[PDB]
Design a protein around this motif. Structure first.
Motif, PDB file in Angstrom:
ATOM      1  N   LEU A   5       0.864  -1.216   0.000  1.00 36.43           N
ATOM      2  CA  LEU A   5       0.000   0.000   0.000  1.00 36.43           C
ATOM      3  C   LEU A   5       0.885   1.246   0.000  1.00 36.43           C
ATOM      4  O   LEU A   5       1.897   1.298   0.686  1.00 36.43           O
ATOM      5  N   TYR A   6       0.485   2.261  -0.744  1.00 34.77           N
ATOM      6  CA  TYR A   6       1.351   3.405  -1.009  1.00 34.77           C
ATOM      7  C   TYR A   6       0.981   4.590  -0.144  1.00 34.77           C
ATOM      8  O   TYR A   6      -0.117   5.128  -0.247  1.00 34.77           O
ATOM      9  N   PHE A   7       1.932   5.020   0.687  1.00 37.76           N
ATOM     10  CA  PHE A   7       1.715   6.184   1.534  1.00 37.76           C
ATOM     11  C   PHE A   7       2.781   7.218   1.240  1.00 37.76           C
ATOM     12  O   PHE A   7       3.932   7.110   1.677  1.00 37.76           O
ATOM     13  N   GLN A   8       2.402   8.190   0.420  1.00 41.20           N
ATOM     14  CA  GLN A   8       3.315   9.230  -0.005  1.00 41.20           C
ATOM     15  C   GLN A   8       3.731  10.029   1.229  1.00 41.20           C
ATOM     16  O   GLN A   8       2.899  10.353   2.057  1.00 41.20           O
ATOM     17  N   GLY A   9       5.017  10.350   1.321  1.00 46.11           N
ATOM     18  CA  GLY A   9       5.556  11.102   2.450  1.00 46.11           C
ATOM     19  C   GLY A   9       5.767  10.245   3.688  1.00 46.11           C
ATOM     20  O   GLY A   9       5.909  10.777   4.759  1.00 46.11           O
ATOM     21  N   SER A  10       5.780   8.920   3.533  1.00 40.77           N
ATOM     22  CA  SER A  10       5.909   8.044   4.664  1.00 40.77           C
ATOM     23  C   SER A  10       7.375   7.795   5.047  1.00 40.77           C
ATOM     24  O   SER A  10       7.639   7.201   6.079  1.00 40.77           O
ATOM     25  N   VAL A  11       8.310   8.241   4.203  1.00 39.34           N
ATOM     26  CA  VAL A  11       9.724   8.074   4.425  1.00 39.34           C
ATOM     27  C   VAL A  11      10.465   9.406   4.218  1.00 39.34           C
ATOM     28  O   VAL A  11      11.143   9.885   5.116  1.00 39.34           O
ATOM     29  N   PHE A  12      10.274  10.030   3.067  1.00 41.10           N
ATOM     30  CA  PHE A  12      10.902  11.310   2.749  1.00 41.10           C
ATOM     31  C   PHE A  12      10.189  12.418   3.472  1.00 41.10           C
ATOM     32  O   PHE A  12       9.011  12.624   3.287  1.00 41.10           O
ATOM     33  N   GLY A  13      10.903  13.081   4.372  1.00 39.57           N
ATOM     34  CA  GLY A  13      10.322  14.123   5.207  1.00 39.57           C
ATOM     35  C   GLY A  13       9.987  13.694   6.613  1.00 39.57           C
ATOM     36  O   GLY A  13       9.631  14.544   7.426  1.00 39.57           O
ATOM     37  N   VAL A  14      10.069  12.396   6.899  1.00 41.89           N
ATOM     38  CA  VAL A  14       9.758  11.859   8.227  1.00 41.89           C
ATOM     39  C   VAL A  14      10.982  11.968   9.150  1.00 41.89           C
ATOM     40  O   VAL A  14      12.093  11.673   8.721  1.00 41.89           O
ATOM     41  N   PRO A  15      10.787  12.406  10.429  1.00 42.24           N
ATOM     42  CA  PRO A  15      11.944  12.500  11.334  1.00 42.24           C
ATOM     43  C   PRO A  15      12.470  11.153  11.751  1.00 42.24           C
ATOM     44  O   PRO A  15      11.708  10.186  11.851  1.00 42.24           O
TER      45      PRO A  15
END
Length: 192
Positions: A1-11
């Motif tokens: 399942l695709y969650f945009q912003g789930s890695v890039f931008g996450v602390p």
């Protein structure tokens, strides 16, 4: 399942909440792929990858399952994706202060004590950042070990990675000075 912003931008701290570690496995696998298979690629971290392929890799990374298979991918896309990862962190890996602290180091600390002042400055980073920086420095060190093949010196890596690791304000003399200090300091660090 695709969650945009789930890695890039996450602390980093949220990554620890979710997976047990400050870097997602999908991100650690990118480093392993480069380290295992791509160290003979000239100009790794310097030469640009292809945007659409870099974007596809971001998207595979932001799948709910924390696992990405990088085989068949150009080293330069993966390397560039890695740079974007650190660039998109909400706070630089190095924290915002260190570009300035590295400057002071080069302004005041003498040649033979700089490494030592650099280690002192780094020990003041948050835990997560320190784990990630350690893993990264050993990784980049492996890259530079293969310099006869890929032509990437500590200095060549530093100049290409500082902006993303430090979040340098890239297109004031003090800002340019911080850029140079951060690059120099990072090069020194990779060199050991």
């Amino acid at each position: 399942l695709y969650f945009q912003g789930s890695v890039f931008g996450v602390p980093l701290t949220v990554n620890v909440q979710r997976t047990g570690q400050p870097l997602p496995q999908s991100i650690q696998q990118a480093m392993r792929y480069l380290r295992n298979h791509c160290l003979d690629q000239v100009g790794l971290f310097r030469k640009s990858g292809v945007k659409s392929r870099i974007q596809a890799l971001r998207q595979m990374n932001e799948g709910a399952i924390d696992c990405v298979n990088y085989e068949g991918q150009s080293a330069y896309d993966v390397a560039d994706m890695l740079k974007q990862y650190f660039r998109d962190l909400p706070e630089p890996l190095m924290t915002n202060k260190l570009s300035e602290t590295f400057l002071q180091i080069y302004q005041y600390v003498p040649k033979d004590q700089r490494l030592q002042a650099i280690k002192a400055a780094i020990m003041l980073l948050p835990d997560e950042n320190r784990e990630v920086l350690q893993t990264l420095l050993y990784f980049l060190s492996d890259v530079t070990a293969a310099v006869k093949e890929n032509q990437m010196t500590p200095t060549n890596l530093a100049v290409c990675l500082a902006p993303s690791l430090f979040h340098l304000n890239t297109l004031d003399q003090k800002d340019l000075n911080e850029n140079l200090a951060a690059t120099q300091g990072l090069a020194h660090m990779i060199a050991e």
